[PDB]
């Protein structure tokens, strides 16, 4: 298959929401390939609407996955290294999937020289 199909598009948004890579999703019988999906994302606004929201839901699923991957890692050097890579890749991806929710968080206390007021000169 390679034609637009709302029922499969919906199907796509569903699996995505649960956390599964799009790669692992399109890899199902009767589903559009990855390239086609990205094509649809340019000729269907109704799709780009269900897709971004699906991506934020996917992120929320992945957030809970990282605890499991870490806590259930097999206590062998290479398996722990793999678990770390799986977690690190997810952490990095989460920030991009929902920057407001999963981006880095910093509080910067801004002060001036010697803890006094910030000194500015203007021309």
Chain residues in the site for a second copy (CB under 8 A) = 14, 17-18, 21-24, 34-35, 38, 57, 60-61, 63-71, 73, 75-93, 95-96, 99-123
Instruction: Give least dist CB 22 to a second copy, A.
Output: 4
Instruction: Give least dist CB 113 to a second copy, A.
Output: 5
Measured CA to CA, the distance from residue 40 to residue 98 in angstroms comes to 22
Instruction: Give least dist CB 101 to a second copy, A.
Output: 7
For residue 96, count CB atoms less than 10 angstroms from its CB and return exposed for 0-12, middle for 13-18, buried for 19 or more: exposed
For residue 7, count CB atoms less than 10 angstroms from its CB and return exposed for 0-12, middle for 13-18, buried for 19 or more: exposed
Radius of gyration of the chain (CA): 21
- Decide whether 8 or 16 has the Cβ nearer to a second copy: 16
- Decide whether 5 or 52 has the Cβ nearer to a second copy: 52
């Amino acid at each position: 298959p390679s034609d637009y199909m709302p029922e499969v598009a919906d199907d796509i948004c569903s699996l995505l929401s649960s956390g599964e890579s799009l790669l692992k999703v399109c890899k199902r019988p009767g589903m559009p390939d990855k390239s086609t999906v990205f094509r649809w994302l340019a000729k269907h606004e109704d799709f780009r609407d269900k897709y971004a929201k699906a991506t934020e839901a996917r992120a929320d699923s992945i957030f809970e996955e990282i605890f499991e991957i870490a806590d259930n890692a097999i206590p062998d050097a290479a398996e722990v290294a793999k678990a770390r890579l799986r977690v690190d890749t997810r952490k990095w991806a989460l920030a991009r999937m929902n920057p407001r929710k999963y981006g880095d968080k910093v509080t910067n206390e801004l002060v001036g020289k010697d803890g006094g007021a910030i000194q500015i000169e203007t021309s």
